[PDB]
Design a protein around this ligand. Sequence first.
Ligand SMILES: Cc1cc2nc3c(=O)[nH]c(=O)nc-3n(C[C@H](O)[C@H](O)[C@H](O)COP(=O)(O)OP(=O)(O)OC[C@H]3O[C@@H](n4cnc5c(N)ncnc54)[C@H](O)[C@@H]3O)c2cc1C
Ligand SMILES: Cc1cc2nc3c(=O)[nH]c(=O)nc-3n(C[C@H](O)[C@H](O)[C@H](O)COP(=O)(O)OP(=O)(O)OC[C@H]3O[C@@H](n4cnc5c(N)ncnc54)[C@H](O)[C@@H]3O)c2cc1C
Ligand SMILES: Cc1cc2nc3c(=O)[nH]c(=O)nc-3n(C[C@H](O)[C@H](O)[C@H](O)COP(=O)(O)OP(=O)(O)OC[C@H]3O[C@@H](n4cnc5c(N)ncnc54)[C@H](O)[C@@H]3O)c2cc1C
Ligand SMILES: Cc1cc2nc3c(=O)[nH]c(=O)nc-3n(C[C@H](O)[C@H](O)[C@H](O)COP(=O)(O)OP(=O)(O)OC[C@H]3O[C@@H](n4cnc5c(N)ncnc54)[C@H](O)[C@@H]3O)c2cc1C
Ligand SMILES: NC(=O)c1ccc[n+]([C@@H]2O[C@H](COP(=O)([O-])OP(=O)(O)OC[C@H]3O[C@@H](n4cnc5c(N)ncnc54)[C@H](OP(=O)(O)O)[C@@H]3O)[C@@H](O)[C@H]2O)c1
Ligand SMILES: NC(=O)c1ccc[n+]([C@@H]2O[C@H](COP(=O)([O-])OP(=O)(O)OC[C@H]3O[C@@H](n4cnc5c(N)ncnc54)[C@H](OP(=O)(O)O)[C@@H]3O)[C@@H](O)[C@H]2O)c1
Ligand SMILES: NC(=O)c1ccc[n+]([C@@H]2O[C@H](COP(=O)([O-])OP(=O)(O)OC[C@H]3O[C@@H](n4cnc5c(N)ncnc54)[C@H](OP(=O)(O)O)[C@@H]3O)[C@@H](O)[C@H]2O)c1
Ligand SMILES: NCCC[C@H](N)C(=O)O
Ligand SMILES: NCCC[C@H](N)C(=O)O
Ligand SMILES: NCCC[C@H](N)C(=O)O
Ligand SMILES: [K+]
Ligand SMILES: [K+]
Ligand SMILES: [K+]
Ligand SMILES: [K+]
Ligand SMILES: [K+]
Lengths: 415, 415, 415, 415
Amino acid sequence: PTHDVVGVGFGPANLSLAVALEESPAALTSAFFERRASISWHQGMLLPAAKMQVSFLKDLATFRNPASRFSFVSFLHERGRLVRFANNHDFFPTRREFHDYLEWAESKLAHEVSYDSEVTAIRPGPGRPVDSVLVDVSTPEATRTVEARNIVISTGLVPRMPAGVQSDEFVWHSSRFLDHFRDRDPRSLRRVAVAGGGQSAAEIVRFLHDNRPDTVVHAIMPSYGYVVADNTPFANQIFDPAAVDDYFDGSKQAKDAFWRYHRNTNYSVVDDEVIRDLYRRGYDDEVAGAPRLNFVNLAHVVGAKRIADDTRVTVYSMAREESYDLDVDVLVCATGYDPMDPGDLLGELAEHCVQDAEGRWQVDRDYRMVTTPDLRCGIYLQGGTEHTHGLSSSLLSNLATRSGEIVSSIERRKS
Amino acid sequence: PTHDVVGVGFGPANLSLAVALEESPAALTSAFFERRASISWHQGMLLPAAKMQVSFLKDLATFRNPASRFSFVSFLHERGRLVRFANNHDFFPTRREFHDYLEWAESKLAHEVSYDSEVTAIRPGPGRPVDSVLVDVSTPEATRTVEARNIVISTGLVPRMPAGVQSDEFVWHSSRFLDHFRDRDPRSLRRVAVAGGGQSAAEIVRFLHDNRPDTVVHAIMPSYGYVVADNTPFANQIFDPAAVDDYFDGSKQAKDAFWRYHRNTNYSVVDDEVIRDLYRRGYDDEVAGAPRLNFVNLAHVVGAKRIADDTRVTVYSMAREESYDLDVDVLVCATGYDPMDPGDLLGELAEHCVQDAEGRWQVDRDYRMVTTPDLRCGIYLQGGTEHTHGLSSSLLSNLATRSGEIVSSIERRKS
Amino acid sequence: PTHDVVGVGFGPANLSLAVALEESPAALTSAFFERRASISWHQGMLLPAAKMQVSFLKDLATFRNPASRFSFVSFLHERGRLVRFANNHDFFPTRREFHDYLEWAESKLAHEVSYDSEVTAIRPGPGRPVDSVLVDVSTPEATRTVEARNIVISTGLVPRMPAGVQSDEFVWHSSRFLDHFRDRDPRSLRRVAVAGGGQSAAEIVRFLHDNRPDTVVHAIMPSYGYVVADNTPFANQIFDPAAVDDYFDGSKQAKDAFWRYHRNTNYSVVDDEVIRDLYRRGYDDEVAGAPRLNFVNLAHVVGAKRIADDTRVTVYSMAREESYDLDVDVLVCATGYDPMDPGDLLGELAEHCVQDAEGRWQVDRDYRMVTTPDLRCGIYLQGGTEHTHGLSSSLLSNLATRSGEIVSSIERRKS
Amino acid sequence: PTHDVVGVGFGPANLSLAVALEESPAALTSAFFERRASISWHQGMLLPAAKMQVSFLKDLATFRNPASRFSFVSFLHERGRLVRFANNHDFFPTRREFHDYLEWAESKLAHEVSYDSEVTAIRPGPGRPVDSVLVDVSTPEATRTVEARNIVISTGLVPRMPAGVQSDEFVWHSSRFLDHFRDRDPRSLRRVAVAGGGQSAAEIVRFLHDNRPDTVVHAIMPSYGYVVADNTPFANQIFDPAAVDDYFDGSKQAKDAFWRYHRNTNYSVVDDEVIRDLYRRGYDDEVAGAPRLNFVNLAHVVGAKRIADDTRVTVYSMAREESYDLDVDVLVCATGYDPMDPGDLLGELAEHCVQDAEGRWQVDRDYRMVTTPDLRCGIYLQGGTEHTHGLSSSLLSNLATRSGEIVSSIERRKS
Ligand SMILES: Cc1cc2nc3c(=O)[nH]c(=O)nc-3n(C[C@H](O)[C@H](O)[C@H](O)COP(=O)(O)OP(=O)(O)OC[C@H]3O[C@@H](n4cnc5c(N)ncnc54)[C@H](O)[C@@H]3O)c2cc1C
Ligand SMILES: Cc1cc2nc3c(=O)[nH]c(=O)nc-3n(C[C@H](O)[C@H](O)[C@H](O)COP(=O)(O)OP(=O)(O)OC[C@H]3O[C@@H](n4cnc5c(N)ncnc54)[C@H](O)[C@@H]3O)c2cc1C
Ligand SMILES: Cc1cc2nc3c(=O)[nH]c(=O)nc-3n(C[C@H](O)[C@H](O)[C@H](O)COP(=O)(O)OP(=O)(O)OC[C@H]3O[C@@H](n4cnc5c(N)ncnc54)[C@H](O)[C@@H]3O)c2cc1C
Ligand SMILES: Cc1cc2nc3c(=O)[nH]c(=O)nc-3n(C[C@H](O)[C@H](O)[C@H](O)COP(=O)(O)OP(=O)(O)OC[C@H]3O[C@@H](n4cnc5c(N)ncnc54)[C@H](O)[C@@H]3O)c2cc1C
Ligand SMILES: NC(=O)c1ccc[n+]([C@@H]2O[C@H](COP(=O)([O-])OP(=O)(O)OC[C@H]3O[C@@H](n4cnc5c(N)ncnc54)[C@H](OP(=O)(O)O)[C@@H]3O)[C@@H](O)[C@H]2O)c1
Ligand SMILES: NC(=O)c1ccc[n+]([C@@H]2O[C@H](COP(=O)([O-])OP(=O)(O)OC[C@H]3O[C@@H](n4cnc5c(N)ncnc54)[C@H](OP(=O)(O)O)[C@@H]3O)[C@@H](O)[C@H]2O)c1
Ligand SMILES: NC(=O)c1ccc[n+]([C@@H]2O[C@H](COP(=O)([O-])OP(=O)(O)OC[C@H]3O[C@@H](n4cnc5c(N)ncnc54)[C@H](OP(=O)(O)O)[C@@H]3O)[C@@H](O)[C@H]2O)c1
Ligand SMILES: NCCC[C@H](N)C(=O)O
Ligand SMILES: NCCC[C@H](N)C(=O)O
Ligand SMILES: NCCC[C@H](N)C(=O)O
Ligand SMILES: [K+]
Ligand SMILES: [K+]
Ligand SMILES: [K+]
Ligand SMILES: [K+]
Ligand SMILES: [K+]
């Protein structure tokens, strides 16, 4: 039984693909594989106050189909919270509510997702040229292999730690903050260091300050202070569907300009409200004569070691150009993520995937990896296209349009 | 040919009724009659800057049907402005754009509206009890009569002038501001008085200030300054669909409380941004040494007379408790509207319509006038239900839910 | 030793009087008497998040003297927080910081305030006509009497409870919220009812929600939802120094208009941010499936009784027009305050004080009570002048100007 | 008659110096020379809507002296606009009001400034080592020379045009926008090109759009859209007085970090409100079917030439990577400014001034140029210190503190 398309990973990207497949008139067969037990959308960072960084109109389908049964508005309506939400006049739902949206959409979905199923490899199907791929799926019980004419790889970002620092029972990446935090005695985290100047670092510091009144926090970051995230309307147009074409069709020189001028829309920046909330907290503590938030600016974390009952963090100060040690209970590294890379999974298919001058995968406008003739099945990327398609590639900004374009591409090449 | 339902008037209310009819599985026959040549939604007040006072989610259908082809989101999508609109992150469209939305929806509607068709009267059909009404329609060419089992009256508000003051060549109600203003030669309106402290008055004064740099404006209002319109989320719940039930089922005492505490959500109040903009304008003029906006507070316009080349406005000052004269070119009365009243159109049928203690029409929860057993046909009101259904009755707030309720009521009764 | 002026009470009002006295070139002798041990500015309501409802520019002196050593800006500067405060770009300090400002100003003040000194009575001095008053002061040790030519009464508002409800171990007025709350055991206040729809009620509910995750709160209020406080710039002009003259010189008709149109600036209304924060809290709880905030609208608390371990609150529902019982641990009445009334402390002198038609004290523009020729000494009111001077009379809005006018009046009479 | 200090230029910087001199107890003699007829603070850009980019608390003196007679608050008070301003609740005055503030402060100043006086050169005084400088001043009538022990150079920024584009009758730098614009027949500027993505470009485009309804505007800028200016509170701390020490004492590596992370606080960025206003304007025009604003993004102006009645602008597109011609009536270059450089004026004295590795002037913490022992007189820079003192050097952010430090330095060295 050969599938038209197999989806690796079931995050918002492949979920929107599933929605696009269902809404398409095209009769396409599909299977989706998620390693986790259920949809799990950055749950390590599902902090109490956390807000979406994208408007509710940017959901699973709305920009492609303005009357989708899978829209956020449909969700609110079924949950009897549309009127309430509307009264709030805020475009940004909580991360918690959006997670419920994802689960709700997955349930409404006709197709049944295969959970606890880790794709361990993708191998060429029989033939030359290769017209199908073999997908190795490892469940808790057995292992199996499915065959598909197309694959869509959407396995998400991979946590990035600072150069000389390894995850530990006392050094956590921000992606696994709540995982470790919940398991911990309250009075076993009175001193916490958080490295980074982005949204994650800011949200964790805010949470720590608000969670206990005694916790002392050291926010270590290279900038002189948090930099604001730009989502003013003109700059925000880089997230437009049409901006994908501008980026894709533009010269390397234009592509560079996107990053040079608009990196501050997405990376190493913090939402206005979070910055201001942190600043008020610091101010009020000063008034009260009880400072707890220590902003260690113009600085990098360069090492961490466990010494008795302390986590010894080595901090490099750019101002003085020297290192020193900071003793805390826990070091949280909110130091970001590296992009999705299909290379690992593609194993030997990769040989046939054409690279560019930089060493990156060549991808067509329709998100399909460029291959030699020796390979003829479709390999589509949702994620890992920051160099070809631009800043929206790993975001929720353009799920609706990308998923639709991929389905169309698949229908057209089967067509 | 007897219609299930005839609609009198084609504003947003009956338009949403038409949409509800089309979306309903029920096979109901209908006809709609609008006097004007086309949809005309307060065009006299379609000022350059004017913004909706209602969220875009409160459109023709969305609260009833979250995936309607007639939703504002569908409209934006079709116009290729959805992405642009989203980037703006504002829930409130311009009045200009909403007008286009109405026209767009009317065009998409399968049914064909009858324009240039004034309903002059509604008369009882043959038989006793009366099972149908006869609707007299006057076109430019002929006159005709149509028969219906139900009618829905949605003829809108009626302009209310100050007591001693009549519309004239130099005394305009705000509802006809642009009608008169465009027909004037600029420079013949160097001195304008605007009476009122509500959104209309504020918008007109702002427009006048911005339109020409030399115009002198007298803003005459009873309050000490503009009062802000409350749309904070808890108070804004009075506009909820469910609030209709709370108001309807509540005692007169409760009904009174709605008005006592929340009149400032809708009447005699001004949007925050408009107030702030007016204040900045006045402040900068002061800095420049060229004041043009004169706020005449704690005051009422009590008369107007034409004397040579001057419109003489008589102003009563509450502070000094005395009247005085103000000479201007034009007096604009932004003094509000009276509610829709179905009594004139009803004529003979009114005898079978039951009134309450206060002499107002009794209306059922489903917007159907209460009648004696002599009348079996349905008379539904969209508008004129402020005393039975509450503050949303004449607003865009609840079009989707009311229209659906009426269609359901008609379907239910159809035997 | 006869003083030019004695001040009864040492809150912000008399504090600004002290400042005006020190800054005045006039050589006036004074004494101030405060019952409490130190300045105590609504400490029972000094909640963690609480923010001033007045701009920092409205401090002890700034509107009168733009370069006062007692300005809030001077305070910030001495506390090394001016730059930090400026970076925040918020006109509204915390109540906590403002309290600190008051104490700071009191210290910087040359004059020494007499604390733990309750003024028990004011009696006429010797002679006829009366040229001085005798002020009876009760300290913890002894009692004494001082003599003064003028007296300024600024004893503050008096807590108002609902009719038929008395303060008790389990029924608290909002003014004494923190007093009682700090003194209970956190696990003993799992169910709290808060009566009222104003700033106090809102702030207490917010605090309760944020303080513990399990507390269940019933917010009982007559309106359908919190009403927003108006401080938009035109309406806000009722707090202007000049507005005092408009109100004072205006007819009763005009005075009524101030209250009719602008009560929503000050009474029974809540700050925008607090309303929105409460609404987000309620929304997120619903998403989480753990509702804790119960808004009991269109309702009054009419009785409270202790029954075993429950405080049984009798609630009247306007909608149903019937009472019912609500069992909680504690009832907090955030039901407001009655104005300052000099009558009680005046005793014998009150006969020579002239009343108006409505039975309230007549007061001159300079805040001096109108007396018969029998009294020649000056009795000045800071507070209790809402009927003569308007809504700013009991607020921080106009401390600088009023205090200056009183000092001037005293200097002028002496002369 | 040898002066303690001579000030070259009379902008806000030297004005704050004059204020610091007057407020200082030190008896220092001074003279100030301004080439313009009066204070002239970027008048070519005094557009109708233009707002200050700095809080009113950052004025001539307030951060140094919180009760200065020259504070903005003192100014508002004198102008009888303090209460009005406070009601507005906006920290940012208009540029127009701030200009009045500067004139007001100059008038209040005891010292009298010499206008129409261009400093053409600074020469060494007699003796070795040099203990004084000779300042050559050229008035309209005569020329003269004054002698001083110290000199403060504050001659402001110098306009920077795009490479290969010269100012002309139809090519204007933004700094001279209103100069040219007022001298032009309104019907002669139908087509305008504005080059740049910063505050100036944005302000000019908004002005053009608002000034005439038919003007077509081409906004040519290298970014994909306007980038927002960061003034959120943590990043804004780079403008703090204390931040000057952090920057000054910090290593080159730290200095670089300031620019790398926080250049978006000051250069090539636009105020939030201006961006959103522009976006609304563009949106409404699209709704109306009359687009007038053309955003030419990812592009540079590389040439301009007059050809008949067309100003021919050559535009380089980074995307397509090709230059094309754009025909307009006028080209406005809002392409920024180069820093103040004392080199030109110093002439012979530069021989005793020390340069750093990069060839820039070495400056001490107290704004005094580093010299050899051959020169003993003080040369102070207000401006041109972006490399030693940081981003605030050419801004209004730190006038009060810098001016005070310079006066102190001078007093200390005369001692
Ligand atoms: C806290 C936070 C941090 C973020 N960091 C960044 C950032 O640094 N840069 C940026 O541009 N955006 C970032 N985002 C955006 C983030 O990428 C999206 O929001 C979203 O999850 C992307 O959707 P996705 O479906 O592509 O990937 P994901 O949601 O991450 O989903 C991938 C799914 O695939 C599964 N999976 C992986 N491998 C396999 C396998 N072999 N077999 C089966 N299943 C597999 C995973 O378990 C996961 O469920 C962040 C958002 C959050 C909230
Ligand atoms: C400037 C302005 C002022 C407003 N004033 C108020 C106010 O004071 N209070 C309030 O609560 N809301 C007010 N509104 C809201 C307003 O009611 C709605 O926005 C909207 O018009 C209501 O929809 P409707 O369809 O019920 O009435 P409508 O939009 O008014 O239209 C009714 C239609 O029926 C037609 N008609 C009338 N008589 C006949 C007839 N005999 N035969 C055939 N056709 C007929 C009319 O031509 C009209 O097109 C105002 C809105 C604006 C923009
Ligand atoms: C929580 C809260 C609630 C408020 N409620 C209202 C309201 O309902 N309406 C309104 O308009 N404004 C209200 N305000 C404003 C309030 O009145 C002021 O902010 C402020 O306290 C006014 O100044 P006073 O100096 O007039 O103050 P009062 O501060 O309250 O201070 C008077 C002082 O006199 C002392 N005193 C009293 N009697 C004697 C005596 N016999 N002998 C010696 N000392 C005595 C008292 O101990 C007190 O310290 C409220 C503010 C807050 C923070
Ligand atoms: C529209 C605009 C653009 C701006 N551009 C920038 C920018 O690009 N980067 C940035 O960081 N900040 C910029 N600013 C800030 C601007 O520098 C300050 O607000 C302010 O003018 C600086 O104060 P100043 O007195 O140091 O210089 P100026 O205000 O410019 O004053 C210098 C004075 O010296 C006079 N002068 C010059 N030479 C002589 C001479 N030989 N003899 C006598 N007098 C002389 C000048 O005519 C002038 O009056 C800008 C502000 C505005 C409003
Ligand atoms: N509520 C939400 O939806 C939510 C929550 C979190 C994140 N996100 C999104 O996810 C994306 C990533 O955000 P992120 O905050 O997780 O990561 P991020 O934006 O990449 O930021 C990483 C930060 O760590 C810094 N850093 C790197 N190495 C360091 C070291 N050795 N010591 C100290 N600091 C170091 C980086 O500095 P440099 O700039 O010098 O590299 C940067 O400030 C963003 O687009 C964000 O908006 C969304
Ligand atoms: N952080 C601060 O600076 C701060 C904090 C608190 C207060 N304040 C100020 O102090 C002033 C007073 O505010 P306030 O909140 O304390 O009082 P209000 O006087 O403003 O509050 C009274 C409220 O309780 C209601 N109420 C009265 N009797 C009731 C009953 N039997 N049952 C249920 N509800 C009842 C009132 O309803 P009705 O309107 O129908 O009578 C009203 O909603 C305001 O100016 C306020 O801004 C400032
Ligand atoms: N209301 C006010 O007080 C006010 C008004 C205006 C300005 N200011 C202040 O003055 C400072 C400077 O503002 P500014 O806008 O005058 O200058 P600016 O910030 O230096 O901006 C100059 C802009 O022109 C661009 N550019 C340079 N060459 C170009 C070319 N050949 N073609 C097209 N674009 C070109 C620059 O691009 P690149 O990014 O690639 O360099 C940059 O976007 C700011 O700090 C600002 O806030 C204040
Ligand atoms: N970090 C996510 C930013 C999302 C982007 N501003 C958007 O609106 O699409
Ligand atoms: N005057 C219009 C009021 C609209 C109302 N706040 C609503 O959101 O429905
Ligand atoms: N471009 C001027 C920036 C001013 C800066 N935000 C400050 O507060 O000093
Ligand atoms: K139908
Ligand atoms: K004195
Ligand atoms: K003292
Ligand atoms: K003292
Ligand atoms: K001096």
